[PDB]
């Protein structure tokens, strides 16, 4: 049957494994990467954000980006042939069609890729913990580039694809959602920060706890690609940390599972926090604090301080950051400290 | 007695101690107990601190209206700058707690001890016959505490500009930093997030690849972990099956097969990235800030065409214009 | 032995205690519903539907009960703000009452199915060992669902033999429970037209009844039974959850 022949061909072991999954992955993954690289150098964000956003206009690798669609578009999928662009390509470009393009395509591309892991895992006969792990990055992309703006007024408030264009996404969240004060974002960082620790710490523990299996100094060659004995003293490592930190692993199976857990759990939490910022259900204030600050003018914490930083961020940014609002804030209304 | 001191040195250095109090430890253990003990008391009961030297006390302790998230140990006064403020430099403790004395007692003892902690991470490795360098991995996170607790203050001219010891107090350090240095637009910070993001990434890669390619030795209803005994001779996972899968995910030559090269990379990446992040804060401590692309792209007439770089400047101005409400008396913020 | 996070695997193939379990859950979910109701009834203020309506009082369950008909209290008041009305037995109190009982019964039922776990019905005549013919089950259940789905749209929402549903003008000023006539036209796919909620349940109900029968008769093509490891209950789960979260992302959007 052709099917099994179609299969046969696909699951054939090439340089770049295709597989059934590839039928979804490669089309998308390439289009996403392509659209970005295209907009980054050719399409502008003038009709959309009143911003130059491509090399062709003068932007450098940091300032370039594929900016979101107008706020007028709302949550429109903005299809090349939809009511907006109307089959026209150039217009599509100027209305930020390239955003939902990269967004939606890349989205499927992350599905395809995880499927791939799942498919290749199965073939090679190994456990799918590489796929479970990758759920974490999906969640982030899904909640941040889709769920979030889906809760807001439109795609316009989703993070625009670009380096700097992402920094404002950060600054925004501080200023408007006071995101750094969110229990979930904290867990997020505890995981990414804590995950980048296990990474570094485990790596060094291994390289400096190795057995001598060669006569050279550059001990890299001294490794048996073909299993057998443990290449580093798991027993010595245990005693080291057990004497310098007080606690130390002693079950490589757990030490490695832990390494999957920490950063995947972290990112999952950071996602939930954002799924909540969609509805604006933020972790903005501490009521007991505000009440005391109202009645008593001499009460000051590093918290109150921050909130004022937010007021400034919102007041001085809102104007050129939300053009569709035709904001006009007279100089006299702009919050400012003394002298500055 | 083979000789008291001779013995003492044998104990200190003994590798049979539950916790290896080393030579570096003799300095560590005390400094760290002082830092810790002073902190805990401060954080719980210390009174308001005139951090900005403008007689406007910022209370940051639990008993004075703070909760875990807001509370912090506030930095020494700006009236003090970089001057040394040991308790014996104050007419009284009341005066010492008001000018943020506890802050210095803590940062100095901590930084001192955390260094020896590094010196120790070497010593024990020596007494145990293992290669050094682990302590060099720990040089990155340490080199950061240093950058954030000492270099930045030295550079800026005051300890009051060092990162506070508290959750929210830290966010303050960040938000303001960004405004005065535009760090997000600095190569070193970016390398920093690459290392941290990357680390967590790789940490997950390794973690999964390995855990997923473990040799079966456990029941269907038995923790897959038991399939490992402390003090094994051979390996507990098929690093050849691991490489087999990962090599097919991307492509063979883009995959590790040498556990030693894998683990070097695993350590090298984050440590190198954080080293740069620490050098970023230590560098922006002398006002060599991030890229300033404000009003770069301008049109044919001279009009200013904004880029995301500009939308970033507005958000920064908001921070600039609002931080330290009452501390400025002049136009330029040179401090 | 079993890690803490696996203790429930002790049911993976004990259809008896699996039902005993699922019975207890339903009991708690029904129980919760009953009592979450009473909590709202003990704190909800009907004194003013204009400026202090249920949604200002952190009411969460009270609305879902009005959307389908229950709009009165045995104490006399009513969601729309009328008096002298006789809700009959099916008042918020009634609904709350009902669930609390359905919960008690499901409990007792969960107990019986736990002790009498080894009923023959779960043992395969052939292999003589525990087994459940999933494919046929799915067909059966799916048949009952569409059969009930149908009825809900056919008799409840239409008013034939039921209350109707909440319907209001374009500015929530008139809302109330009213019988809604189906709508098979195109505008019946418009989320804001009640007629569509009726048509849907009648059509989908039927399609559901048909499809059930199919699955009660036609067997699963070998190719699939193999691919989707059917006859392995822990796969019925993987698919259901995928559906359950799909349903979820949708209710959150509407």
């Amino acid at each position: 049957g052709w099917f099994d022949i179609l299969d046969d061909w696909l699951k054939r072991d090439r340089f770049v494994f295709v597989g059934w999954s590839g039928i979804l992955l490669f089309p998308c993954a390439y289009l996403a990467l392509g659209g970005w690289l295209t907009g980054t150098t050719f399409v502008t964000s003038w009709y959309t954000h009143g911003l130059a956003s491509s090399y062709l206009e003068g932007c450098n690798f940091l300032t370039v980006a594929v900016s979101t669609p107008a706020n007028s578009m709302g949550h429109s999928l903005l299809l090349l042939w939809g009511p907006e662009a109307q089959g026209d390509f150039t217009r599509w470009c100027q209305l930020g069609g390239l955003w939902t393009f990269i967004a939606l395509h890349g989205a499927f591309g992350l599905i395809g890729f995880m499927l791939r892991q799942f498919e290749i895992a199965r073939l090679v006969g190994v456990r799918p913990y590489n796929a479970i792990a990758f759920s974490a990055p999906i969640a982030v992309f899904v909640s941040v580039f889709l769920i979030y703006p889906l809760g807001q007024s439109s795609w316009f408030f989703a993070p625009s694809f670009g380096v700097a264009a992402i920094f404002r996404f950060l600054l925004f969240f501080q200023g408007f959602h006071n995101w750094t004060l969110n229990p979930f974002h904290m867990m997020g960082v505890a995981g990414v920060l804590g995950g980048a620790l296990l990474c570094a710490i485990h790596g060094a523990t291994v390289e400096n706890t190795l057995f001598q299996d060669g006569e050279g100094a550059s001990t890299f060659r001294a490794f048996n690609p073909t299993q057998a004995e443990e290449t580093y003293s798991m027993v010595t490592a245990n005693r080291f940390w057990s004497q310098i930190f007080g606690i130390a692993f002693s079950n490589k199976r757990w030490l490695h599972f832990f390494m999957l857990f920490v950063p995947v759990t972290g990112l999952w939490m950071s996602a939930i926090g954002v799924v909540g910022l969609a509805l604006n259900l933020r972790s903005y204030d501490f009521i007991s604090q505000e009440i005391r600050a109202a009645e008593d003018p001499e009460f000051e914490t590093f918290y109150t301080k921050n909130l004022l930083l937010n007021e400034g961020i919102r007041a001085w940014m809102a104007p050129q950051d939300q053009p569709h609002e035709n904001f006009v804030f007279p100089e006299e209304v702009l919050p400012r400290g003394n002298a500055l | 007695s083979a000789n008291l001191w001779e013995r003492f040195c044998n104990w200190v250095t003994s590798t049979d101690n539950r916790l290896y109090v080393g030579w570096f430890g003799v300095i560590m253990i005390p400094t760290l107990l002082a830092a810790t003990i002073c902190f805990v008391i401060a954080f719980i009961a210390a009174p308001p601190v005139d951090i900005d030297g403008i007689r406007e006390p910022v209370s940051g302790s639990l008993l004075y209206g703070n909760n875990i998230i807001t509370g912090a140990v506030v930095p020494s006064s700006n009236a003090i700058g970089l001057h040394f403020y040991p308790i014996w430099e104050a007419a009284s403790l009341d005066e010492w707690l008001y000018n943020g004395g506890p802050y210095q007692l803590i940062i100095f003892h901590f930084l001192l001890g955390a260094s020896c902690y590094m010196g120790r991470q070497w010593e024990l490795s020596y007494r145990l016959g293992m290669r050094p360098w682990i302590c060099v991995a720990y040089s990155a996170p340490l080199a950061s505490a240093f950058a954030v607790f000492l270099i930045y203050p030295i550079g800026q001219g005051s300890f009051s500009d060092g990162m506070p010891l508290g959750i929210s107090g830290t966010f303050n350090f960040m938000i303001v930093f960004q405004a005065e240095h535009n760090i997000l637009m600095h190569p070193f910070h970016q390398l920093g997030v690459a290392g941290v993001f990357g680390g967590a990434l790789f940490c997950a890669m390794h973690g999964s690849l390995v855990t997923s390619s473990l040799i079966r030795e456990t029941t269907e209803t038995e923790s897959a972990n038991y399939g490992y005994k402390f003090g094994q001779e051979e390996e507990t996972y098929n690093i050849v099956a691991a490489h087999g899968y990962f090599g097919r995910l991307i492509f063979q030559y883009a995959s590790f097969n040498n556990s030693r090269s894998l683990h070097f990379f695993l350590a090298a990446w984050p440590v190198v990235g954080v080293w740069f992040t620490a050098l970023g804060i230590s560098t922006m401590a002398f006002n060599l800030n991030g890229f300033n692309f404000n009003h770069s792209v301008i049109d044919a007439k001279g009009n200013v065409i904004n880029t995301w770089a500009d939308i970033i400047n507005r958000a920064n101005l908001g921070m600039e214009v609002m931080h330290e409400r009452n501390a400025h008396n002049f136009p330029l913020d040179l401090a | 032995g079993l890690p803490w996070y696996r203790v429930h695997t002790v049911l993976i193939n004990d259809p008896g205690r699996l039902i005993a379990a699922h019975l207890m859950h339903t009991a708690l979910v029904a129980g919760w519903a009953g009592s979450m109701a009473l909590y709202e009834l003990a704190t909800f203020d009907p004194s003013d539907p204009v400026l202090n309506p249920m949604w200002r009082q952190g009411m969460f369950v009270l609305p879902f009960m009005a959307r389908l008909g229950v709009t009165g209290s045995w104490s006399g008041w009513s969601i729309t703000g009328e008096t002298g009305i006789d809700p009959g037995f099916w008042s918020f109190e009634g609904v709350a009452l009902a669930h609390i009982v359905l919960s008690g019964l499901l409990f007792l039922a969960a107990c019986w199915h736990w002790v009498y776990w080894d009923l023959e019905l779960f043992r395969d005549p052939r292999t003589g060992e525990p087994a459940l013919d999933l494919p046929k089950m799915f067909g059966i259940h799916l048949f009952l669902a569409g059969l009930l789905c149908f009825g809900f749209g056919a008799f409840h929402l239409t008013g034939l033999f039921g209350p109707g549903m909440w319907v209001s003008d374009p500015y929530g000023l008139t809302g109330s429970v009213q019988p809604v006539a189906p709508e098979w036209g195109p505008d019946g796919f418009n989320p804001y037209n009640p007629g569509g909620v009726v048509a849907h349940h009648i059509a989908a109900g039927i399609v559901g009844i048909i499809a059930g029968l199919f699955h009660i008769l036609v067997r699963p093509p070998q190719r699939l039974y193999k691919a989707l490891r059917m006859g392995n209950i822990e796969t019925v789960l993987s698919s259901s959850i995928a559906a359950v979260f799909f349903a979820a992302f949708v209710v959150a959007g509407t």
């Binding site: 799942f118 899904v142 | 040799i215 | 490891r229 995928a242 979260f245």
Partner: peptide
């Protein structure tokens, strides 16, 4: 969004029941 993870988990655990508990031989 949390349930998605359950699906991915249970699904995987169904298609890889065999390799659960670990793997074995050949090269």
């Amino acid at each position: 969004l949390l349930f998605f993870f359950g699906h991915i988990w249970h699904g995987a655990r169904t298609l890889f029941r065999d390799v659960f508990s670990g793997i074995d031989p050949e090269l």
